Amino acid sequence: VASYDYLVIGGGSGGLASARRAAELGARAAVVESHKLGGTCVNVGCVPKKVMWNTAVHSEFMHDHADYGFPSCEGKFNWRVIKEKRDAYVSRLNAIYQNNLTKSHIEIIRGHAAFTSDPKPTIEVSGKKYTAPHILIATGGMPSTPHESQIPGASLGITSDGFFQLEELPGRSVIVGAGYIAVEMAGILSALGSKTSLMIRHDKVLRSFDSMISTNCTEELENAGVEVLKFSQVKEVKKTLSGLEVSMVTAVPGRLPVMTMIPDVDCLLWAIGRVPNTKDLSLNKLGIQTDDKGHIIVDEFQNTNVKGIYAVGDVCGKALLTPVAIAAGRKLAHRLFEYKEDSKLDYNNIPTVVFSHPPIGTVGLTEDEAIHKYGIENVKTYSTSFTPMYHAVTKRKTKCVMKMVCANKEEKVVGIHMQGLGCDEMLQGFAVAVKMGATKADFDNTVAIHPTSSEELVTLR
Amino acid sequence: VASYDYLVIGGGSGGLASARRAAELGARAAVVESHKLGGTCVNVGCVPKKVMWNTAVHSEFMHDHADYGFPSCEGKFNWRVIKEKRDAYVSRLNAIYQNNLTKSHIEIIRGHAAFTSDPKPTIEVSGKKYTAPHILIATGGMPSTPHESQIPGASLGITSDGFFQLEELPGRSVIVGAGYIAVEMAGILSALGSKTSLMIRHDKVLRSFDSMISTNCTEELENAGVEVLKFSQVKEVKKTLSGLEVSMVTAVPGRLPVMTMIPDVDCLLWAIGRVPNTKDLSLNKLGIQTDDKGHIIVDEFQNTNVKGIYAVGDVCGKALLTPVAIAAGRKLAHRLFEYKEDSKLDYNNIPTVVFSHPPIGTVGLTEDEAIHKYGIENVKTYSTSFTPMYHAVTKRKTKCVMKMVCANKEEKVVGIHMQGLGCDEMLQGFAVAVKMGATKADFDNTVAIHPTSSEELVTLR
Ligand SMILES: Cc1cc2nc3c(=O)[nH]c(=O)nc-3n(C[C@H](O)[C@H](O)[C@H](O)COP(=O)(O)OP(=O)(O)OC[C@H]3O[C@@H](n4cnc5c(N)ncnc54)[C@H](O)[C@@H]3O)c2cc1C
Ligand SMILES: Cc1cc2nc3c(=O)[nH]c(=O)nc-3n(C[C@H](O)[C@H](O)[C@H](O)COP(=O)(O)OP(=O)(O)OC[C@H]3O[C@@H](n4cnc5c(N)ncnc54)[C@H](O)[C@@H]3O)c2cc1C
User: Fold this and answer.
1) Considering CB atoms only, which of A70, A324, A427 is closest to B62?
2) Domains of chain A with CATH codes
3) Which residues of B touch A322 (CB under 8 A)?
4) Which residues take part in binding FAD (chains A, B)?
């Protein structure tokens, strides 16, 4: 039984981040990974997605070429040209991450880990046993898919994982789901040329975001050529002579339901949710607490109900973002190996960017959350809607919407929500400001940068 | 002699901003303008420049089309197509600004204003006299040009004003100057297809910016095809049979000077400086203080040496930016008509974006200024240099450089400097943070947004 100071299960965003900071602090650490280092983000997440988003953005701007005095671009997009370059980039990143580990003297145990029946917390990878006074579970999650029992022919559709395996652009695609992953996929496919439909259970996408955003995003999707099928869901899917045939039910409130068949579908993409990767961990062997979805339960310090065992990242089911897994993993390493018992991550004011077209940026409370926390009487919001200067000379147009949520008489900025060109790189700084507890006065007393879209946020009235 | 509560001379950024805020406070105001409302920024500055920058950005991205799986774009840029659309946009803005004035009940006195010999401060516009207890001078400035006496044939070149009158793309252009206007002009002309040369007196451009920026910007200019002629200056210009012939002297330190002739130049653009517009104001009639450049001297409250007379904007020669003129103008209106005697603009931490390729963003002190203000021992800087993810799949590359200047043990962020894709919309928020007095810890405790370039600033080490 080989012993280490720190055993990290899962070589993804949180695991690697935690292991590397620990090693820096003098801990003898080891990382267990059954697949490719970098985890979900690097291999089938953030990275390949951003590359594809940059590709879609190229398509959109190509539509404006003539408006800007250039000759019209004619071409059909060649998917496998970009797919190959994308795959290669991911390969380079994998090699880099391995190198980072070796340089830090972190041992890499290749294989699938599971807890043993042994008294003191111990795991087994390929017959060999390993243990440590501190063990971190950062196994992440996977795409959720419907059961054939509930939706016949469900296994005929793909998930976001399959999306990155596609070698050709699907002629016709149907995406099911209304979360950020669904929105992003629909946006990329549509911009690249696929006749795309997005099937959502209600009337708007991203319903957990501020109402101004969900409303605006749904509209922009439609303006971009995406067919948004509201109040609908798949009843069954079947393989026809040429492609799939999707049977769906549309039940608009105050109306009679109606069944519809969508034929000649080349790609059915399920983007309905994520499930934690805890099934084959043998967590029961140690009695580690989980909820009914399989998420590991942790306190504010990432502690599980068992001493010496922690969890961070997607596996805990809260704030499923790479930077959050990373920050939580680092804060943990500092608390354990630098003995800063107050070291933990504040899950409030975590910023998010959704790579739609245009992109969405958000941080803090939505107007509704602020109203429930401070009371309608104490919440004031400021907002604006304009057409970015970039479209002053184009026939095609997109909008830019911004909303600031303030609380109390001091007008503390508790939330910022926006969608528009450049909003993806615009958010970070304001997020710092909001984390610092800025008030509207602080924003107002900052000289604007002109001409930009960002200056609108410091000149709201 | 018609009397008002507030008389504003100049209908540009600062003048209009001040007049409108004053009216809001109940003041009976009037604005004197001899030309087009909107001033320099709207008519021959920020606006038309940004439109042209967006056009140049289109050209750059078109070079990457093939790399992103699209068929190569072939076309020659058609200048007058964009010039006409640009002119029209400026026309719309002019109409809008006039409307804004009327709606606020601000009187517009068309004509050139000058102070009279009259005791109490009075001005005359087209024979009629006007007065007020408070008069604001916001006449801005104009492009500086060499005297024929010093540089023969100087009048053969154009200024930034002339640049916006160009109806065709110059085949060969030479820009003289090393400030932001020169850099921007060179960048646009070069990207649009003109064989461009930038003539600078020393070895780098933007020498008043942080050394990392001036160095990087000079390199990027060269990588973009701009011929940077260092340690050179024009000796004389003459009109030949086809275009201009520029005679220049290149005096590299530690070398013998050498004269060179640049033939077939279609456009010689002087971007050497700006002179204040105070010459025909008859300021002497009231003994208003100015420096030897013609700039009106003011205290921290925009007061001139004469009671009841103020000045803001480019005419005062400090921080020549539209947002600064606007903020100073508004702060003044609040002090005068809302009686907030402490109302004034803080000229520290004013953010600036230079629309180069890639764009530059800066706010606060450069490393050298921080060292002179706090001492080498108390100044710490953090920086990084990387290739934006957007170029992971392109043959063409640009870099992204970022530098954070911290002071004292607390590591207060006193300066942020960067250049790279997206930096134009990235700065505003960090500027708010810096204005609030953030420390490196505040930046470090803000969760990153991934994948973006902006996340690099909150993960510096
Ligand atoms: C399509 C999509 C796009 C996304 N885009 C973004 C974005 O753009 N920005 C963002 O911030 N987030 C994004 N996310 C979410 C981000 O990918 C995850 O939040 C992040 O990867 C979670 O980090 P993790 O450490 O918790 O898990 P993971 O990264 O998933 O790593 C878990 C690792 O554990 C390994 N593992 C599992 N079980 C064990 C075992 N029993 N033993 C050994 N190894 C094992 C898996 O192989 C894997 O590598 C994206 C998610 C996806 C699916
Ligand atoms: C090429 C260039 C690009 C620039 N790009 C930017 C940028 O991108 N962002 C930025 O922030 N800044 C930019 N600037 C600087 C910005 O244009 C000025 O900082 C800003 O216009 C100054 O405001 P002002 O109120 O002081 O003067 P102005 O805008 O110049 O207005 C002065 C007004 O006074 C009028 N006037 C003058 N004399 C009198 C008189 N005797 N009576 C009656 N009317 C009269 C003039 O007609 C004019 O309209 C740019 C400058 C230029 C030249």
Assistant:
1) A70
2) 1-143+273-348 (3.50.50.60), 144-272 (3.50.50.60), 349-459 (3.30.390.30)
3) 450
4) 13-14, 33, 40-41, 49, 113, 314, 322, 450
